[PDB]
Amino acid sequence: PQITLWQRPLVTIKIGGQLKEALLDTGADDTVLEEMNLPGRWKPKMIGGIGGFIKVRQYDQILIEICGHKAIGTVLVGPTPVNIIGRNLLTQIGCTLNF
Amino acid sequence: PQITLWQRPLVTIKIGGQLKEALLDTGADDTVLEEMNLPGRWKPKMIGGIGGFIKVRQYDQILIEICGHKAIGTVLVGPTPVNIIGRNLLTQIGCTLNF
Ligand SMILES: COc1cc(CN2C(=O)N(Cc3ccc(O)c(OC)c3)N(Cc3ccccc3)C[C@@H](O)[C@H]2Cc2ccccc2)ccc1O
């Protein structure tokens, strides 16, 4: 769909059998979700944002359905205030910026 | 123009006579730029990001040219690692997210 930016670009996602709302974030290279019950192995990683860095658990090959569209990619899970869908998954659902 | 998201969405901006590159960021409510010379009065403010909070100076009614489109709005200046154009100015240049 076309999303104007007068309010935050929030979308419903289904990940690990759970329903969540997440921000479509063109400034984010990675997808990072708040702490959740997600199965399997993960590697430690660190990401830096405004205000500093956070330690996240990195899961690969995770299925996410973002507004009905399936995608599989890396998901970082950790102490973010907001669920973020970043550019690694936005390219997969064919999302563009237009002006 | 239409911008796909395989690379960071960076654009040239002109602000206070100086030329800079900035990220088009739909996850950012506000525009925050690295420390720069900027004329005027300002109010201290704090913004929260992924690793925590930073103190910024808020400048109102600042002219910014973003890819040859002029906009006037609030600009926050402070210790961000990247120049961020957030939704307060993205709606002014008519930017939409599409998928
Ligand atoms: C509430 O408004 C604002 C919020 C921010 C902070 N914020 C961040 O901390 N991240 C960091 C980041 C997240 C995920 C990544 O995958 C990443 O990699 C580049 C960086 N970036 C900006 C950034 C990019 C590169 C380097 C440093 C910073 C994406 C933003 O939308 C936003 C995400 C966010 C929104 C709301 C709450 C928490 C985080 C900035 C400006 C604002 O006006």
UniProtKB/Swiss-Prot annotation, chains A, B:
Q: How does it assemble?
A: Homodimer, whose active site consists of two apposed aspartic acid residues.
Q: Domain of life of the organism in this record?
A: Viruses
The gene designation is gag-pol
Please name the catalytic residues of this protein: 25 (for protease activity)
Residues annotated as domain Peptidase A2: 20-89
Query: Any idea what this protein is called?
Result: Protease
> Which residues, by range, are in coiled-coil regions?
none
Write out the function statement from the record: Aspartyl protease that mediates proteolytic cleavages of Gag and Gag-Pol polyproteins during or shortly after the release of the virion from the plasma membrane. Cleavages take place as an ordered, step-wise cascade to yield mature proteins. This process is called maturation. Displays maximal activity during the budding process just prior to particle release from the cell. Also cleaves Nef and Vif, probably concomitantly with viral structural proteins on maturation of virus particles. Hydrolyzes host EIF4GI and PABP1 in order to shut off the capped cellular mRNA translation.
Q: Where is this region: Dimerization of protease?
A: 1-5, 49-55, 88-99
